[PDB]
């Protein structure tokens, strides 16, 4: 009796459940939304204690058969706090690392951007937006200069990637904070439940994208409270003009 | 307010 439990984002936990209903054991896996890349190993009640990078090679009677990737990649549940972004800031997510890279943006004066490594279809999760977890009070009370990377998660929590973690040399465990804004975007932000990061948001394609295409999302600031940085306000006027 | 995607 194997079970699969899917999150709305298409990731899943899979394994034999224990005497209670629980995803607890040495041979449990989280499988990413490509239904191929997996973190396989020790889980307790669905929390990843030690997941090793693996590839789902086939299923037989519903049971997944994995091959472990070479190396000693081990991941664990490591949800951020208000002050700690990650226990392993420089350890990349292995799914994201196959799909995106950071380079100078094609948008003029927009710094770095996030690009597709590979051609993908619509509705494809490309990247994860992890960061520290702070309150709306803190973010809303403070200057725009500090709020370049703040992303609302829900009514209680904002995710931020504060300096110096906005540089890839200090933090590359996730890369969603590298996608620039467009009013004509190819991606959206979407909820995601990640086995290392916990409840976060991801960048998901709206349409097919080609290899080396810049990924962009609409940042969705309030246009009539605009409560937004200057560069966006400019860009809004121009958009409304077209 | 001062965050994306609210
Ligand atoms: C979430 S980060 C995006 C990645 C950033 N460009 C970097 O190099 O780390 C947000 C910042 O990117 C810049 N940005 C994003 N979209 C832009 C656009 N359409 N035009 C100009 N600047 C943009 C602004 O400086 C903003 O504070």
PDB file of C-alpha atoms and ligand atoms in Angstrom:
ATOM      1  CA  UNK A   1       0.000   0.000   0.000  1.00  0.00           C
ATOM      2  CA  UNK A   2       1.859   3.036  -1.372  1.00  0.00           C
ATOM      3  CA  UNK A   3       0.233   6.460  -1.094  1.00  0.00           C
ATOM      4  CA  UNK A   4       0.738   9.674  -3.075  1.00  0.00           C
ATOM      5  CA  UNK A   5      -0.353  12.966  -1.517  1.00  0.00           C
ATOM      6  CA  UNK A   6      -0.343  15.909  -3.977  1.00  0.00           C
ATOM      7  CA  UNK A   7      -0.155  19.583  -3.107  1.00  0.00           C
ATOM      8  CA  UNK A   8      -2.131  21.977  -5.276  1.00  0.00           C
ATOM      9  CA  UNK A   9       1.126  23.025  -6.932  1.00  0.00           C
ATOM     10  CA  UNK A  10       1.768  19.512  -8.289  1.00  0.00           C
ATOM     11  CA  UNK A  11       4.581  18.424  -5.951  1.00  0.00           C
ATOM     12  CA  UNK A  12       3.820  15.347  -3.877  1.00  0.00           C
ATOM     13  CA  UNK A  13       4.866  13.119  -1.007  1.00  0.00           C
ATOM     14  CA  UNK A  14       4.985   9.412  -1.814  1.00  0.00           C
ATOM     15  CA  UNK A  15       5.642   6.335   0.273  1.00  0.00           C
ATOM     16  CA  UNK A  16       4.213   3.592   2.454  1.00  0.00           C
ATOM     17  CA  UNK A  17       2.389   5.262   5.304  1.00  0.00           C
ATOM     18  CA  UNK A  18       2.868   4.022   8.901  1.00  0.00           C
ATOM     19  CA  UNK A  19       0.472   2.370  11.373  1.00  0.00           C
ATOM     20  CA  UNK A  20      -1.263   5.739  11.760  1.00  0.00           C
ATOM     21  CA  UNK A  21      -1.908   7.594   8.517  1.00  0.00           C
ATOM     22  CA  UNK A  22       1.517   9.234   8.473  1.00  0.00           C
ATOM     23  CA  UNK A  23       4.293   9.797   5.904  1.00  0.00           C
ATOM     24  CA  UNK A  24       6.954   8.522   8.257  1.00  0.00           C
ATOM     25  CA  UNK A  25       9.800   6.162   7.306  1.00  0.00           C
ATOM     26  CA  UNK A  26      13.179   5.731   5.674  1.00  0.00           C
ATOM     27  CA  UNK A  27      11.956   5.389   2.093  1.00  0.00           C
ATOM     28  CA  UNK A  28       9.580   8.370   1.700  1.00  0.00           C
ATOM     29  CA  UNK A  29      10.091  10.883  -1.173  1.00  0.00           C
ATOM     30  CA  UNK A  30       9.077  14.394  -2.123  1.00  0.00           C
ATOM     31  CA  UNK A  31       8.652  14.526  -5.888  1.00  0.00           C
ATOM     32  CA  UNK A  32       8.883  17.940  -7.597  1.00  0.00           C
ATOM     33  CA  UNK A  33       6.259  19.087 -10.146  1.00  0.00           C
ATOM     34  CA  UNK A  34       8.260  17.613 -13.087  1.00  0.00           C
ATOM     35  CA  UNK A  35       7.161  14.255 -11.654  1.00  0.00           C
ATOM     36  CA  UNK A  36      10.840  13.167 -12.067  1.00  0.00           C
ATOM     37  CA  UNK A  37      13.188  15.015  -9.679  1.00  0.00           C
ATOM     38  CA  UNK A  38      12.901  13.728  -6.102  1.00  0.00           C
ATOM     39  CA  UNK A  39      14.296  14.033  -2.609  1.00  0.00           C
ATOM     40  CA  UNK A  40      14.240  10.517  -1.146  1.00  0.00           C
ATOM     41  CA  UNK A  41      14.903   9.245   2.371  1.00  0.00           C
ATOM     42  CA  UNK A  42      13.919   9.846   5.950  1.00  0.00           C
ATOM     43  CA  UNK A  43      10.691  11.758   6.636  1.00  0.00           C
ATOM     44  CA  UNK A  44       8.632  12.119   9.829  1.00  0.00           C
ATOM     45  CA  UNK A  45       4.905  12.928   9.446  1.00  0.00           C
ATOM     46  CA  UNK A  46       5.721  14.420   6.025  1.00  0.00           C
ATOM     47  CA  UNK A  47       8.647  16.601   7.257  1.00  0.00           C
ATOM     48  CA  UNK A  48      11.926  15.934   5.379  1.00  0.00           C
ATOM     49  CA  UNK A  49      14.626  14.874   7.829  1.00  0.00           C
ATOM     50  CA  UNK A  50      17.177  13.677   5.298  1.00  0.00           C
ATOM     51  CA  UNK A  51      16.253  13.751   1.591  1.00  0.00           C
ATOM     52  CA  UNK A  52      18.808  12.596  -0.980  1.00  0.00           C
ATOM     53  CA  UNK A  53      18.604  13.785  -4.579  1.00  0.00           C
ATOM     54  CA  UNK A  54      17.132  11.034  -6.807  1.00  0.00           C
ATOM     55  CA  UNK A  55      15.411  10.537 -10.129  1.00  0.00           C
ATOM     56  CA  UNK A  56      12.041   8.789 -10.393  1.00  0.00           C
ATOM     57  CA  UNK A  57      12.767   6.187 -13.086  1.00  0.00           C
ATOM     58  CA  UNK A  58       9.411   4.308 -13.227  1.00  0.00           C
ATOM     59  CA  UNK A  59       6.444   3.223 -11.158  1.00  0.00           C
ATOM     60  CA  UNK A  60       5.310  -0.362 -10.751  1.00  0.00           C
ATOM     61  CA  UNK A  61       1.805  -0.914  -9.366  1.00  0.00           C
ATOM     62  CA  UNK A  62       1.866   2.692  -8.229  1.00  0.00           C
ATOM     63  CA  UNK A  63       5.190   2.283  -6.380  1.00  0.00           C
ATOM     64  CA  UNK A  64       7.892   4.704  -7.432  1.00  0.00           C
ATOM     65  CA  UNK A  65      11.345   3.306  -8.238  1.00  0.00           C
ATOM     66  CA  UNK A  66      14.164   5.811  -7.761  1.00  0.00           C
ATOM     67  CA  UNK A  67      17.834   6.038  -8.671  1.00  0.00           C
ATOM     68  CA  UNK A  68      19.971   8.166  -6.323  1.00  0.00           C
ATOM     69  CA  UNK A  69      22.049  10.803  -7.979  1.00  0.00           C
ATOM     70  CA  UNK A  70      25.757  10.669  -7.396  1.00  0.00           C
ATOM     71  CA  UNK A  71      27.278  12.830  -4.719  1.00  0.00           C
ATOM     72  CA  UNK A  72      26.239  13.419  -1.170  1.00  0.00           C
ATOM     73  CA  UNK A  73      23.490  16.021  -1.693  1.00  0.00           C
ATOM     74  CA  UNK A  74      21.330  15.867   1.498  1.00  0.00           C
ATOM     75  CA  UNK A  75      18.428  18.278   2.074  1.00  0.00           C
ATOM     76  CA  UNK A  76      16.223  18.882   5.090  1.00  0.00           C
ATOM     77  CA  UNK A  77      13.240  20.909   6.149  1.00  0.00           C
ATOM     78  CA  UNK A  78      14.731  24.343   7.037  1.00  0.00           C
ATOM     79  CA  UNK A  79      11.959  26.935   7.090  1.00  0.00           C
ATOM     80  CA  UNK A  80      13.220  30.556   7.326  1.00  0.00           C
ATOM     81  CA  UNK A  81      12.555  32.730  10.362  1.00  0.00           C
ATOM     82  CA  UNK A  82      12.383  36.525  10.639  1.00  0.00           C
ATOM     83  CA  UNK A  83      16.157  36.632  10.904  1.00  0.00           C
ATOM     84  CA  UNK A  84      17.548  33.468   9.253  1.00  0.00           C
ATOM     85  CA  UNK A  85      17.042  32.916   5.490  1.00  0.00           C
ATOM     86  CA  UNK A  86      18.587  29.369   5.385  1.00  0.00           C
ATOM     87  CA  UNK A  87      21.019  27.072   7.217  1.00  0.00           C
ATOM     88  CA  UNK A  88      22.680  26.525   3.813  1.00  0.00           C
ATOM     89  CA  UNK A  89      22.463  29.784   1.948  1.00  0.00           C
ATOM     90  CA  UNK A  90      24.853  28.640  -0.803  1.00  0.00           C
ATOM     91  CA  UNK A  91      23.337  25.178  -1.448  1.00  0.00           C
ATOM     92  CA  UNK A  92      21.141  25.574  -4.590  1.00  0.00           C
ATOM     93  CA  UNK A  93      17.788  23.879  -5.101  1.00  0.00           C
ATOM     94  CA  UNK A  94      18.483  21.033  -7.551  1.00  0.00           C
ATOM     95  CA  UNK A  95      15.152  21.406  -9.493  1.00  0.00           C
ATOM     96  CA  UNK A  96      15.603  25.188  -9.944  1.00  0.00           C
ATOM     97  CA  UNK A  97      19.266  24.698 -10.945  1.00  0.00           C
ATOM     98  CA  UNK A  98      18.204  22.762 -14.054  1.00  0.00           C
ATOM     99  CA  UNK A  99      15.686  25.386 -15.146  1.00  0.00           C
ATOM    100  CA  UNK A 100      16.928  28.926 -14.513  1.00  0.00           C
ATOM    101  CA  UNK A 101      20.084  31.049 -14.390  1.00  0.00           C
ATOM    102  CA  UNK A 102      20.817  34.643 -13.387  1.00  0.00           C
ATOM    103  CA  UNK A 103      22.327  37.212 -15.895  1.00  0.00           C
ATOM    104  CA  UNK A 104      22.065  40.933 -16.668  1.00  0.00           C
ATOM    105  CA  UNK A 105      18.418  41.738 -17.406  1.00  0.00           C
ATOM    106  CA  UNK A 106      17.307  42.684 -20.919  1.00  0.00           C
ATOM    107  CA  UNK A 107      15.214  45.477 -19.326  1.00  0.00           C
ATOM    108  CA  UNK A 108      17.410  48.631 -19.330  1.00  0.00           C
ATOM    109  CA  UNK A 109      18.667  49.735 -15.862  1.00  0.00           C
ATOM    110  CA  UNK A 110      16.923  46.770 -14.139  1.00  0.00           C
ATOM    111  CA  UNK A 111      20.088  45.094 -12.840  1.00  0.00           C
ATOM    112  CA  UNK A 112      20.137  41.274 -12.912  1.00  0.00           C
ATOM    113  CA  UNK A 113      17.297  39.083 -14.195  1.00  0.00           C
ATOM    114  CA  UNK A 114      16.185  35.473 -14.221  1.00  0.00           C
ATOM    115  CA  UNK A 115      16.402  33.442 -17.442  1.00  0.00           C
ATOM    116  CA  UNK A 116      15.225  30.046 -18.680  1.00  0.00           C
ATOM    117  CA  UNK A 117      17.948  27.424 -19.225  1.00  0.00           C
ATOM    118  CA  UNK A 118      15.590  25.200 -21.260  1.00  0.00           C
ATOM    119  CA  UNK A 119      12.425  25.412 -23.391  1.00  0.00           C
ATOM    120  CA  UNK A 120       9.318  24.599 -21.284  1.00  0.00           C
ATOM    121  CA  UNK A 121       5.536  24.503 -21.673  1.00  0.00           C
ATOM    122  CA  UNK A 122       2.854  26.552 -19.958  1.00  0.00           C
ATOM    123  CA  UNK A 123       2.156  26.189 -16.239  1.00  0.00           C
ATOM    124  CA  UNK A 124       5.790  25.126 -15.472  1.00  0.00           C
ATOM    125  CA  UNK A 125       7.259  25.874 -12.012  1.00  0.00           C
ATOM    126  CA  UNK A 126      10.680  27.451 -12.770  1.00  0.00           C
ATOM    127  CA  UNK A 127      11.962  28.999  -9.569  1.00  0.00           C
ATOM    128  CA  UNK A 128      11.227  29.406  -5.829  1.00  0.00           C
ATOM    129  CA  UNK A 129      10.864  32.632  -3.850  1.00  0.00           C
ATOM    130  CA  UNK A 130      12.167  31.918  -0.421  1.00  0.00           C
ATOM    131  CA  UNK A 131      13.282  34.608   2.079  1.00  0.00           C
ATOM    132  CA  UNK A 132      12.984  35.778   5.669  1.00  0.00           C
ATOM    133  CA  UNK A 133       9.450  36.042   7.110  1.00  0.00           C
ATOM    134  CA  UNK A 134       8.487  39.454   8.435  1.00  0.00           C
ATOM    135  CA  UNK A 135       5.225  41.352   9.094  1.00  0.00           C
ATOM    136  CA  UNK A 136       3.261  43.711   6.869  1.00  0.00           C
ATOM    137  CA  UNK A 137       3.593  46.336   9.674  1.00  0.00           C
ATOM    138  CA  UNK A 138       7.379  46.297   9.355  1.00  0.00           C
ATOM    139  CA  UNK A 139       7.428  46.432   5.621  1.00  0.00           C
ATOM    140  CA  UNK A 140       4.656  49.030   5.188  1.00  0.00           C
ATOM    141  CA  UNK A 141       6.163  51.398   7.815  1.00  0.00           C
ATOM    142  CA  UNK A 142       9.591  51.490   6.179  1.00  0.00           C
ATOM    143  CA  UNK A 143      11.075  53.187   3.081  1.00  0.00           C
ATOM    144  CA  UNK A 144      10.783  51.819  -0.473  1.00  0.00           C
ATOM    145  CA  UNK A 145      14.518  51.581  -0.667  1.00  0.00           C
ATOM    146  CA  UNK A 146      14.309  48.623   1.780  1.00  0.00           C
ATOM    147  CA  UNK A 147      11.372  46.995  -0.073  1.00  0.00           C
ATOM    148  CA  UNK A 148      12.808  46.045  -3.426  1.00  0.00           C
ATOM    149  CA  UNK A 149      12.444  42.311  -2.676  1.00  0.00           C
ATOM    150  CA  UNK A 150       9.380  42.098  -0.428  1.00  0.00           C
ATOM    151  CA  UNK A 151       6.722  39.631  -1.651  1.00  0.00           C
ATOM    152  CA  UNK A 152       3.445  39.221   0.187  1.00  0.00           C
ATOM    153  CA  UNK A 153       2.855  35.570   1.174  1.00  0.00           C
ATOM    154  CA  UNK A 154      -0.497  35.844   2.953  1.00  0.00           C
ATOM    155  CA  UNK A 155      -2.344  38.214   5.292  1.00  0.00           C
ATOM    156  CA  UNK A 156       0.193  37.720   8.134  1.00  0.00           C
ATOM    157  CA  UNK A 157       3.576  37.313   6.354  1.00  0.00           C
ATOM    158  CA  UNK A 158       5.836  39.045   3.865  1.00  0.00           C
ATOM    159  CA  UNK A 159       8.869  37.204   2.417  1.00  0.00           C
ATOM    160  CA  UNK A 160      11.980  39.345   1.931  1.00  0.00           C
ATOM    161  CA  UNK A 161      15.491  38.811   0.585  1.00  0.00           C
ATOM    162  CA  UNK A 162      17.315  41.644   2.350  1.00  0.00           C
ATOM    163  CA  UNK A 163      20.851  42.855   1.469  1.00  0.00           C
ATOM    164  CA  UNK A 164      23.394  41.251   1.240  1.00  0.00           C
ATOM    165  CA  UNK A 165      21.384  38.105   0.382  1.00  0.00           C
ATOM    166  CA  UNK A 166      20.196  39.786  -2.845  1.00  0.00           C
ATOM    167  CA  UNK A 167      23.644  38.872  -4.259  1.00  0.00           C
ATOM    168  CA  UNK A 168      24.077  35.406  -5.623  1.00  0.00           C
ATOM    169  CA  UNK A 169      27.530  35.181  -3.979  1.00  0.00           C
ATOM    170  CA  UNK A 170      25.812  35.387  -0.541  1.00  0.00           C
ATOM    171  CA  UNK A 171      22.584  33.471  -1.267  1.00  0.00           C
ATOM    172  CA  UNK A 172      21.660  31.094  -4.080  1.00  0.00           C
ATOM    173  CA  UNK A 173      19.509  28.465  -2.345  1.00  0.00           C
ATOM    174  CA  UNK A 174      16.567  29.947  -4.340  1.00  0.00           C
ATOM    175  CA  UNK A 175      16.432  32.499  -7.176  1.00  0.00           C
ATOM    176  CA  UNK A 176      12.838  33.737  -7.471  1.00  0.00           C
ATOM    177  CA  UNK A 177      13.824  37.194  -6.206  1.00  0.00           C
ATOM    178  CA  UNK A 178      15.862  37.606  -9.391  1.00  0.00           C
ATOM    179  CA  UNK A 179      12.834  37.835 -11.753  1.00  0.00           C
ATOM    180  CA  UNK A 180      12.087  41.333 -12.949  1.00  0.00           C
ATOM    181  CA  UNK A 181       8.703  43.037 -13.374  1.00  0.00           C
ATOM    182  CA  UNK A 182       6.750  43.288 -16.612  1.00  0.00           C
ATOM    183  CA  UNK A 183       3.220  44.471 -17.274  1.00  0.00           C
ATOM    184  CA  UNK A 184       3.318  41.929 -20.099  1.00  0.00           C
ATOM    185  CA  UNK A 185       4.752  39.025 -18.135  1.00  0.00           C
ATOM    186  CA  UNK A 186       5.480  35.402 -19.140  1.00  0.00           C
ATOM    187  CA  UNK A 187       5.137  34.049 -15.543  1.00  0.00           C
ATOM    188  CA  UNK A 188       3.083  34.514 -12.422  1.00  0.00           C
ATOM    189  CA  UNK A 189       3.799  34.162  -8.697  1.00  0.00           C
ATOM    190  CA  UNK A 190       1.941  31.131  -7.300  1.00  0.00           C
ATOM    191  CA  UNK A 191       1.707  29.403  -3.852  1.00  0.00           C
ATOM    192  CA  UNK A 192       4.140  26.546  -3.382  1.00  0.00           C
ATOM    193  CA  UNK A 193       4.793  24.082  -0.556  1.00  0.00           C
ATOM    194  CA  UNK A 194       8.486  23.176  -0.633  1.00  0.00           C
ATOM    195  CA  UNK A 195      10.061  20.322   1.333  1.00  0.00           C
ATOM    196  CA  UNK A 196      13.099  22.449   2.348  1.00  0.00           C
ATOM    197  CA  UNK A 197      11.613  25.980   2.370  1.00  0.00           C
ATOM    198  CA  UNK A 198       8.058  25.233   3.623  1.00  0.00           C
ATOM    199  CA  UNK A 199       5.137  27.400   2.434  1.00  0.00           C
ATOM    200  CA  UNK A 200       6.504  29.927  -0.014  1.00  0.00           C
ATOM    201  CA  UNK A 201       5.710  31.250  -3.521  1.00  0.00           C
ATOM    202  CA  UNK A 202       7.146  30.083  -6.855  1.00  0.00           C
ATOM    203  CA  UNK A 203       7.504  31.508 -10.349  1.00  0.00           C
ATOM    204  CA  UNK A 204       5.284  29.548 -12.759  1.00  0.00           C
ATOM    205  CA  UNK A 205       5.059  30.076 -16.575  1.00  0.00           C
ATOM    206  CA  UNK A 206       1.739  31.320 -18.096  1.00  0.00           C
ATOM    207  CA  UNK A 207       2.780  30.113 -21.569  1.00  0.00           C
ATOM    208  CA  UNK A 208       5.519  28.177 -23.332  1.00  0.00           C
ATOM    209  CA  UNK A 209       8.952  29.788 -23.009  1.00  0.00           C
ATOM    210  CA  UNK A 210      12.089  29.269 -25.094  1.00  0.00           C
ATOM    211  CA  UNK A 211      15.603  28.563 -23.822  1.00  0.00           C
ATOM    212  CA  UNK A 212      17.360  31.791 -22.706  1.00  0.00           C
ATOM    213  CA  UNK A 213      14.131  33.780 -22.493  1.00  0.00           C
ATOM    214  CA  UNK A 214      13.942  36.315 -19.645  1.00  0.00           C
ATOM    215  CA  UNK A 215      11.343  35.368 -17.056  1.00  0.00           C
ATOM    216  CA  UNK A 216       9.172  38.219 -15.777  1.00  0.00           C
ATOM    217  CA  UNK A 217       6.176  38.527 -13.481  1.00  0.00           C
ATOM    218  CA  UNK A 218       3.745  41.382 -12.765  1.00  0.00           C
ATOM    219  CA  UNK A 219       4.647  42.633  -9.322  1.00  0.00           C
ATOM    220  CA  UNK A 220       1.031  43.733  -8.735  1.00  0.00           C
ATOM    221  CA  UNK A 221       1.430  46.821  -6.580  1.00  0.00           C
ATOM    222  CA  UNK A 222      -1.713  48.783  -5.681  1.00  0.00           C
ATOM    223  CA  UNK A 223      -2.415  51.216  -8.522  1.00  0.00           C
ATOM    224  CA  UNK A 224      -5.107  53.139  -6.626  1.00  0.00           C
ATOM    225  CA  UNK A 225      -4.706  53.217  -2.824  1.00  0.00           C
ATOM    226  CA  UNK A 226       0.179  54.271  -6.974  1.00  0.00           C
ATOM    227  CA  UNK A 227       1.915  52.793  -3.888  1.00  0.00           C
ATOM    228  CA  UNK A 228       5.008  51.615  -5.747  1.00  0.00           C
ATOM    229  CA  UNK A 229       8.675  52.488  -6.394  1.00  0.00           C
ATOM    230  CA  UNK A 230       9.412  55.247  -8.952  1.00  0.00           C
ATOM    231  CA  UNK A 231      10.672  52.941 -11.710  1.00  0.00           C
ATOM    232  CA  UNK A 232       7.368  51.030 -11.650  1.00  0.00           C
ATOM    233  CA  UNK A 233       5.259  54.207 -11.570  1.00  0.00           C
ATOM    234  CA  UNK A 234       7.046  55.366 -14.695  1.00  0.00           C
ATOM    235  CA  UNK A 235       6.480  52.000 -16.300  1.00  0.00           C
ATOM    236  CA  UNK A 236       2.774  51.986 -15.355  1.00  0.00           C
ATOM    237  CA  UNK A 237       2.092  55.282 -17.205  1.00  0.00           C
ATOM    238  CA  UNK A 238       3.880  53.948 -20.322  1.00  0.00           C
ATOM    239  CA  UNK A 239       1.882  50.702 -20.109  1.00  0.00           C
ATOM    240  CA  UNK A 240      -1.441  52.541 -19.720  1.00  0.00           C
ATOM    241  CA  UNK A 241      -0.420  54.615 -22.773  1.00  0.00           C
ATOM    242  CA  UNK A 242       0.003  51.581 -25.096  1.00  0.00           C
TER     243      UNK A 242
ATOM    244  CA  UNK B   1       1.113  47.820   0.556  1.00  0.00           C
ATOM    245  CA  UNK B   2       4.881  47.920   0.105  1.00  0.00           C
ATOM    246  CA  UNK B   3       5.284  44.315  -1.112  1.00  0.00           C
ATOM    247  CA  UNK B   4       4.584  42.485  -4.406  1.00  0.00           C
ATOM    248  CA  UNK B   5       1.515  40.325  -5.148  1.00  0.00           C
ATOM    249  CA  UNK B   6      -0.766  41.300  -2.195  1.00  0.00           C
TER     250      UNK B   6
HETATM  251  C1  LIG C   1      12.945  41.333  -6.922  1.00  0.00           C
HETATM  252  S1  LIG C   1      14.274  42.215  -7.476  1.00  0.00           S
HETATM  253  C2  LIG C   1      14.566  41.700  -9.078  1.00  0.00           C
HETATM  254  C3  LIG C   1      16.022  41.321  -9.376  1.00  0.00           C
HETATM  255  C4  LIG C   1      16.948  42.567  -9.414  1.00  0.00           C
HETATM  256  N1  LIG C   1      16.898  43.190 -10.737  1.00  0.00           N
HETATM  257  C5  LIG C   1      18.374  42.232  -9.005  1.00  0.00           C
HETATM  258  O1  LIG C   1      19.321  42.531  -9.774  1.00  0.00           O
HETATM  259  O2  LIG C   1      18.584  41.598  -7.920  1.00  0.00           O
HETATM  260  C6  LIG C   1      13.545  43.747  -7.526  1.00  0.00           C
HETATM  261  C7  LIG C   1      14.364  44.923  -8.095  1.00  0.00           C
HETATM  262  O3  LIG C   1      14.635  44.792  -9.480  1.00  0.00           O
HETATM  263  C8  LIG C   1      14.479  46.045 -10.173  1.00  0.00           C
HETATM  264  N2  LIG C   1      13.430  45.923 -11.207  1.00  0.00           N
HETATM  265  C9  LIG C   1      12.565  44.899 -11.350  1.00  0.00           C
HETATM  266  N3  LIG C   1      11.784  45.074 -12.455  1.00  0.00           N
HETATM  267  C10 LIG C   1      12.171  46.240 -13.029  1.00  0.00           C
HETATM  268  C11 LIG C   1      11.746  47.010 -14.217  1.00  0.00           C
HETATM  269  N4  LIG C   1      10.738  46.565 -15.019  1.00  0.00           N
HETATM  270  N5  LIG C   1      12.389  48.185 -14.453  1.00  0.00           N
HETATM  271  C12 LIG C   1      13.397  48.616 -13.667  1.00  0.00           C
HETATM  272  N6  LIG C   1      13.818  47.986 -12.551  1.00  0.00           N
HETATM  273  C13 LIG C   1      13.245  46.788 -12.209  1.00  0.00           C
HETATM  274  C14 LIG C   1      14.169  47.102  -9.144  1.00  0.00           C
HETATM  275  O4  LIG C   1      15.467  47.626  -8.826  1.00  0.00           O
HETATM  276  C15 LIG C   1      13.633  46.265  -7.991  1.00  0.00           C
HETATM  277  O5  LIG C   1      13.908  46.845  -6.720  1.00  0.00           O
END
